[PDB]
């Protein structure tokens, strides 16, 4: 039971919580902002750029707020888990 | 009508669309912005829009103004430069006539070329 608590509920989630605030961190590894999903979704959000191209003659990284909501949104993930759930009608 | 002429070039020109009146002939969503899916309000029409030829006019007015504005969205710039094509455009100076007809149209499609042209090279080069 240990290591499934600590393999398969904490760890999971502690990677997506360093996952999502160090993606801020990189330069541009592939041109296409792209995200893996759970279900084999792959979605590009962001606009299609243009190809730098010369027609005629900045990234989005995060403020406090974001910052506490995601370490809020970590714990609570945990603690909504069927293995810790207490108190609810749930 | 003045500023609603100016409404109307505005659209067909750089595809925004400002009525806080709700008075223009179509209208967006938002009542994300990706299903950018426009309505007919066909009570404020100049035309029963029932055959097939005032069908076409609204048609490509919708389709010349959606272009513009995915160009505008794409591009990261809310307004086109006048001096981006060859063909270019005035106001509707004298609406009387234009109102009649054999006018409507030619600006109309004049402005439709205009549209194809920067919309296919926007999608062949850039």
Same mark, same amino acid.
Not at chain 1, 23 to 30: G, I, L, V, Y
Not at chain 1, 50 to 55: F, G, H, N, Q, S
Not at chain 2, 41 to 51: A, E, T, Y
């Given at each position: 039971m240990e290591s499934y608590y600590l393999n398969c509920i904490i760890e999971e989630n502690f990677k997506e919580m360093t996952r999502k605030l160090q993606?801020? $961190?990189?330069?541009?590894?592939?041109q296409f902002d792209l995200i893996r999903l759970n279900n084999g979704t792959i979605e590009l959000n962001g606009i299609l750029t243009?190809?730098? $191209?010369?027609?005629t003659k900045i990234e989005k990284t995060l403020n406090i707020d974001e910052l506490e909501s995601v370490h809020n949104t970590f714990l609570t993930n945990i603690l909504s888990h069927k293995l810790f759930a207490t108190n609810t009608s749930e | 009508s003045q500023d609603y002429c100016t409404m109307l070039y505005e659209w067909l020109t750089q595809g925004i669309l400002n009525d806080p009146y709700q008075e223009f002939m179509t209208y967006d969503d938002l009542e994300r912005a990706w299903d950018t899916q426009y309505f007919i309000?066909?009570?404020?029409?100049?035309?029963?829009?029932?055959?097939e030829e005032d069908k076409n006019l609204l048609f490509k007015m919708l389709r010349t103004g959606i272009l513009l504005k995915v160009v505008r969205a794409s591009l990261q710039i809310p307004t086109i430069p006048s001096n981006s094509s060859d063909i270019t455009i005035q106001e509707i100076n004298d609406f009387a006539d234009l109102m009649?007809?054999?006018n409507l149209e030619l600006y109309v499609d004049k402005c439709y070329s205009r549209a194809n042209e920067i919309f296919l090279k926007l999608f062949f080069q850039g």
């Open positions: 993606r801020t $961190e990189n330069k541009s590894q592939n243009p190809k730098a $191209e010369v027609l | 309000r066909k009570d404020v029409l100049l035309r029963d829009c029932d055959s009649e007809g054999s």
